Amino acid sequence: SPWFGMDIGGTLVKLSYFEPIDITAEEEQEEVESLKSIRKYLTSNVAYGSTGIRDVHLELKDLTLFGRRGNLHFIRFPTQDLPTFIQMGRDTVLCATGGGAYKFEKDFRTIGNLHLHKLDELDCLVKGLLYIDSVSFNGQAECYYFANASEPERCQKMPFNLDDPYPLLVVNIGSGVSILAVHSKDNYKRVTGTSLGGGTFLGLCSLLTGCESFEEALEMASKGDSTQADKLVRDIYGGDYERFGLPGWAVASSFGNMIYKEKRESVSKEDLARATLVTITNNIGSVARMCAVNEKINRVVFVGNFLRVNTLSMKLLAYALDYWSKGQLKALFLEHEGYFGAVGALLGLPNF
Amino acid sequence: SPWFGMDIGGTLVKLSYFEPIDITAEEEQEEVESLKSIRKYLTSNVAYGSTGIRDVHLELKDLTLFGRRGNLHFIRFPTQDLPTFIQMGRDTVLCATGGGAYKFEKDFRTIGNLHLHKLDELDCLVKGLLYIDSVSFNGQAECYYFANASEPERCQKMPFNLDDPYPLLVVNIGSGVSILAVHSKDNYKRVTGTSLGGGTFLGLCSLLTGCESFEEALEMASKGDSTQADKLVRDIYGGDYERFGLPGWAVASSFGNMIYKEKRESVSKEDLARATLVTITNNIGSVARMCAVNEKINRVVFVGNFLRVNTLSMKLLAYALDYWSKGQLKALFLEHEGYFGAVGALLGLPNF
Ligand SMILES: Nc1ncnc2c1ncn2[C@@H]1O[C@H](COP(=O)(O)OP(=O)(O)NP(=O)(O)O)[C@@H](O)[C@H]1O
Ligand SMILES: Nc1ncnc2c1ncn2[C@@H]1O[C@H](COP(=O)(O)OP(=O)(O)NP(=O)(O)O)[C@@H](O)[C@H]1O
Numbered sequence: 001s002p003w004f005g006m007d008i009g010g011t012l013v014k015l016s017y018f019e020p021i022d023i024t025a026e027e028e029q030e031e032v033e034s035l036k037s038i039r040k041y042l043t044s045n046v047a048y049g050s051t052g053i054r055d056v057h058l059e060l061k062d063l064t065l066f067g068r069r070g071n072l073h074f075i076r077f078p079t080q081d082l083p084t085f086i087q088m089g090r091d092t093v094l095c096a097t098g099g100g101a102y103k104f105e106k107d108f109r110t111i112g113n114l115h116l117h118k119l120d121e122l123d124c125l126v127k128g129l130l131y132i133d134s135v136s137f138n139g140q141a142e143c144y145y146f147a148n149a150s151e152p153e154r155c156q157k158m159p160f161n162l163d164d165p166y167p168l169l170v171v172n173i174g175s176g177v178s179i180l181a182v183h184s185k186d187n188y189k190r191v192t193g194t195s196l197g198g199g200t201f202l203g204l205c206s207l208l209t210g211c212e213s214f215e216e217a218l219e220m221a222s223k224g225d226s227t228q229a230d231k232l233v234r235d236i237y238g239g240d241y242e243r244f245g246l247p248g249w250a251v252a253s254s255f256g257n258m259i260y261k262e263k264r265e266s267v268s269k270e271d272l273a274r275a276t277l278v279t280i281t282n283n284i285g286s287v288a289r290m291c292a293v294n295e296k297i298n299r300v301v302f303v304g305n306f307l308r309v310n311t312l313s314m315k316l317l318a319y320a321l322d323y324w325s326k327g328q329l330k331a332l333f334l335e336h337e338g339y340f341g342a343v344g345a346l347l348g349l350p351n352f
Numbered sequence: 353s354p355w356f357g358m359d360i361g362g363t364l365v366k367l368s369y370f371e372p373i374d375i376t377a378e379e380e381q382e383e384v385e386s387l388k389s390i391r392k393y394l395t396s397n398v399a400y401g402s403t404g405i406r407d408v409h410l411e412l413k414d415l416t417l418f419g420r421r422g423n424l425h426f427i428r429f430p431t432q433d434l435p436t437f438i439q440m441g442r443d444t445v446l447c448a449t450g451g452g453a454y455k456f457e458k459d460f461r462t463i464g465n466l467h468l469h470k471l472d473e474l475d476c477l478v479k480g481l482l483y484i485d486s487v488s489f490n491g492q493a494e495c496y497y498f499a500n501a502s503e504p505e506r507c508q509k510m511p512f513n514l515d516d517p518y519p520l521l522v523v524n525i526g527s528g529v530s531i532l533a534v535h536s537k538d539n540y541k542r543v544t545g546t547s548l549g550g551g552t553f554l555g556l557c558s559l560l561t562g563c564e565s566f567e568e569a570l571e572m573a574s575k576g577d578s579t580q581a582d583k584l585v586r587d588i589y590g591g592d593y594e595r596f597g598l599p600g601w602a603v604a605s606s607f608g609n610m611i612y613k614e615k616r617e618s619v620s621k622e623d624l625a626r627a628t629l630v631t632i633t634n635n636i637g638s639v640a641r642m643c644a645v646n647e648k649i650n651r652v653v654f655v656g657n658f659l660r661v662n663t664l665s666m667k668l669l670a671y672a673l674d675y676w677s678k679g680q681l682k683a684l685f686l687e688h689e690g691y692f693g694a695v696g697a698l699l700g701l702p703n704f
């Protein structure tokens with residue numbers, strides 16, 4: 001069977017596909033035509049239908065997995081379009097994780113003789129993260145941070161070594177947020193979560209601005225000024241509040257200036273998009289900091305797809321975590337941040 | 353001079369006024385006419401101008417303060433209307449706290465010979481809270497909780513004793529949120545804060561629903577269904593997620609269902625108001641729980657005016673704190689929750 005790992009989230013389905021490249025002359029004859037058309041279709045296209053996308057830049061090449069060499073591909077599409085995916089299949093062992101592995105279990109079994117193996121979301125995320133970092137990103141670091149995140153004339157992306165990754169606080173920003181504490185390869189726990197995640201950003205931004213996509217929401221936010229909607233410390237005090245170490249630029253009340261009708265009438269869509277992004281991102285960073293202090297962990301890695309093509313939130317997290325922790329916490333990021341559950345699911349295949 | 357304590361916040365000015373009731377025959381003759389008209393005007397009216405309100409139900413009667421007996425009155429008005437207040441004064445020692453004590457310092461000194469004494473916000477809140485609880489609410493408890501907050505057929509308001517109030521986690525919900533740890537009468541600290549507070553609720557609700565007042569926002573929210581906007585755990589999994597103790601009704605992504613255009617077109621204003629209230633309140637409770645765990649404090653008291661005439665948020669905080677802490681944290685509330693800074697400022701008067 002084709003080796004696939006699937007993570008069916010509330011918003012996106014993430015798929016990891018291992019394409020063998022050591023196909024002998026005999027193995028190619030023994031392969032069925034449906035298998036050849038599948039492998040050709042996946043490798044000959046970067047867009048699948050109207051909503052499927054292969055993230056070509058993330059591909060791992062010449063990976064040795066399960067005793068074979070191949071390429072590891074990373075594919076995503078909206079969970080809303082899973083019926084189309086299943087219908088394409090109806091006309092194999094599937095290791096699946098995420099909430100949709102349970103919700104859509106009966107749907108996957110409409111594909112005759114298909115064996116669906118639901119795998120623990122926490123196990124898949126941790127095993128997938130540790131595996132990708134162990135094999136590296138084609139010889140480059142999988143993990144990176146923003147060095148000197150306080151000075152913008154110096155803030156630049158730099159590699160970070162996770163060869164001894166324990167302990168680790170994993171902040172998974174999907175539709176919501178889950179916070180995980182990883183103490184060893186076999187000792188990890190879900191600490192807590194918050195409901196203010198990527199779905200909040202996208203849903204609120206759509207209500208406030210009328211944007212029609214995650215990308216359009218980010219483009220609006222890049223042009224906006226969140227201080228037009230937010231009430232800052234200096235709006236309340238007239239300046240910094242030194243007694244409690246609060247700079248004048250710190251947000252005292254997100255959207256707090258929107259209690260005034262005249263300010264609601266002058267704010268732009270871009271301003272509101274930026275204020276939504278800043279509000280959600282700062283809240284995520286603050287919860288991550290509080291959890292790191294309680295878990296006594298100083299390395300905080302952020303995953304999920306809320307940070308995909310989202311350098312604003314990445315740099316805001318790097319700056320905020322460093323600033324508010326007085327330099328005691330480090331914000332870490334991962335190139336394959338959206339796909340670790342799908343990889344971890346694929347890695348559960350030998351158990352069946 | 354008239355004995356006043358003032359807390360000038362980003363949204364509301366809170367005023368505590370001590371009305372002496374042991375005025376002798378001689379003292380009444382010696383009083384100036386402007387003083388008599390002030391005392392009569394404050395005690396003969398419950399509405400001052402178009403935006404000032406005296407919370408008559410909070411009045412403390414026959415209080416002995418600074419060697420005199422009197423009544424302690426509690427008055428509020430929007431900070432936006434402070435210029436009108438100052439202009440009424442221009443046609444005394446003022447102990448003032450809050451951010452506006454700094455921002456509007458020069459404005460108060462336009463009142464000739466008026467001495468403004470800015471007092472620390474943390475000192476005023478703690479001293480005011482401990483004082484009011486010490487003198488009781490006219491013989492009734494100042495502090496209360498919601499007993500059996502898990503069962504709605506049993507959840508009822510019940511008094512709580514704070515005669516030995518240490519340690520105490522104070523969660524001050526104004527425009528934003530400040531979290532304080534009180535270890536003794538002279539040992540207390542600001543732990544942290546969050547920018548998702550009452551100003552976020554009011555500002556977002558006004559943007560999303562067009563409501564024109566805090567009261568109208570609460571009335572809309574009482575009629576709404578937050579699950580029309582929020583994505584729940586059961587929306588993602590099809591039910592409860594027992595592996596991590598997450599019930600199906602828990603919110604996985606606030607406003608997360610608003611990523612779908614068809615759901616944005618069917619949601620009502622009341623639903624969005626309720627989702628705003630639930631989102632802000634749950635985030636406040638979660639941050640309070642995390643801070644309580646780190647500070648090793650099990651009594652969490654909520655103050656500010658976000659909870660004024662807001663039983664929904666109070667009961668949500670009581671239920672959530674008890675449920676998510678497995679019964680190890682207790683949500684506490686105070687009748688004079690919006691006025692402790694103003695009282696603490698009034699109590700600083702003998703120092704001048
Ligand atoms: N093309 C996209 N479409 C939708 N959302 C996107 C897209 N790209 C990035 N995002 C963001 O990524 C978030 C979803 O991240 P993701 O890690 O895939 O979560 P999920 O698994 O689908 N949901 P969950 O069930 O909570 O794990 C969305 O809420 C958006 O903020
Ligand atoms: N009549 C009202 N007008 C405005 N807001 C109200 C009113 N009644 C209750 N509120 C709520 O109370 C919150 C303000 O609470 P409050 O404790 O008075 O804060 P503040 O001191 O004015 N702001 P801060 O500078 O952050 O301390 C508002 O954000 C509303 O959510």
Ligand SMILES: CC(=O)OCC(=O)Nc1ccc(CC(=O)N2CCN(c3ccc(Cl)nn3)CC2)cc1
Nearest residue numbers: 121122176177178193194195604637638672673676
């Ligand atoms: C392994 C993995 O990634 O799983 C995926 C995942 O976790 N999805 C998910 C994300 C977020 C949530 C929300 C949440 O966790 N909670 C718990 C804590 N809450 C409160 C509320 C009030 C108080 Cl006073 N205290 N706590 C808020 C709701 C639920 C599921």
Ligand SMILES: CC(=O)OCC(=O)Nc1ccc(CC(=O)N2CCN(c3ccc(Cl)nn3)CC2)cc1
Nearest residue numbers: 252285286320321324473474528529530545546547
């Ligand atoms: C005594 C009293 O009541 O004073 C009144 C008061 O406090 N007003 C007030 C309320 C709230 C605030 C906001 C805030 O405190 N912060 C600090 C923590 N932040 C972050 C962000 C990211 C990360 Cl990664 N970490 N931390 C967010 C901003 C500021 C003032």
Ligand SMILES: [Cl-]
Nearest residue numbers: 116117118119
């Ligand atoms: Cl299974």
Ligand SMILES: [Cl-]
Nearest residue numbers: 468469470471
């Ligand atoms: Cl002073």
Ligand SMILES: [Mg+2]
Nearest residue numbers: 009010098174
């Ligand atoms: Mg996910």
Ligand SMILES: [Mg+2]
Nearest residue numbers: 361362450526
């Ligand atoms: Mg205040």
